[PDB]
Design a protein around this ligand. Structure first.
Ligand SMILES: Nc1nc2c(ncn2[C@@H]2O[C@H](COP(=O)(O)OP(=O)(O)NP(=O)(O)O)[C@@H](O)[C@H]2O)c(=O)[nH]1
Ligand SMILES: [Ca+2]
Ligand SMILES: [Ca+2]
Ligand SMILES: [Mg+2]
Ligand SMILES: [Mg+2]
Length: 164
């Protein structure tokens, strides 16, 4: 019935779970409970096509078998937070991991700068645009808190999988 397997990766606390929960359940998770590995499914219409999204929400905390879960992914949301410079610097490492698990240099991906509602910005849009350009992928900013950009980020990833 047309299924897209999406995987959300990135450093601990950047908002991977909050983003996914906003997309699927339409509310903001205010508390921080570190994830091990969670799965969500939802039927949606994207550009006139009824499809099923299967979303894997992965651990960002080193302490919390991710590789095995990521293997099945068709597209990856690589998330950092715009007030967390280290999370941005670590994007390179997540992308390298994706390329290992997929054994390919051509994997559908979108770069996401989350927490754009916050004002303590240390990653400027232009820096992230440049990183995304070097990877040949789109950059999109989101806020799981306000819901701004959330649907756009996930639907953009579906549109990247369709170009593969
Ligand atoms: N202001 C604001 N807070 C956010 C946003 N997204 C997430 N948060 C907050 O940041 C904290 C961590 O969010 P969470 O979604 O659990 O992060 P995670 O990337 O899933 N963490 P982990 O890798 O450990 O599972 C929570 O307190 C959450 O409310 C956002 O867009 N804006
Ligand atoms: Ca809440
Ligand atoms: Ca491999
Ligand atoms: Mg989480
Ligand atoms: Mg600077």
């Amino acid at each position: 019935m047309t299924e897209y397997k999406l995987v959300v990766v990135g450093a601990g606390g950047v908002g991977k779970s909050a983003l996914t929960i906003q997309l699927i359940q339409n509310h903001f998770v205010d508390e921080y409970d570190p994830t091990i590995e969670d799965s969500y499914r939802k039927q949606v219409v994207i550009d006139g096509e009824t499809c099923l999204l299967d979303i894997l929400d992965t651990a960002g905390q080193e302490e919390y078998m991710r590789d095995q879960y990521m293997r099945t992914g068709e597209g990856f949301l690589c998330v950092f937070a715009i007030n967390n410079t280290k999370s941005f610097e670590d994007i390179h490492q997540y992308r390298e991991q994706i390329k290992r698990v997929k054994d390919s240099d051509d994997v559908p991906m979108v770069l996401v700068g989350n927490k754009c509602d916050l004002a303590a910005r240390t990653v400027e849009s232009r820096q992230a645009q440049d990183l995304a350009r070097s990877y040949g992928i789109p950059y999109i900013e989101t806020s799981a808190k306000t819901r701004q950009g959330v649907e756009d980020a996930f639907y953009t990833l579906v549109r990247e999988i369709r170009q593969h």
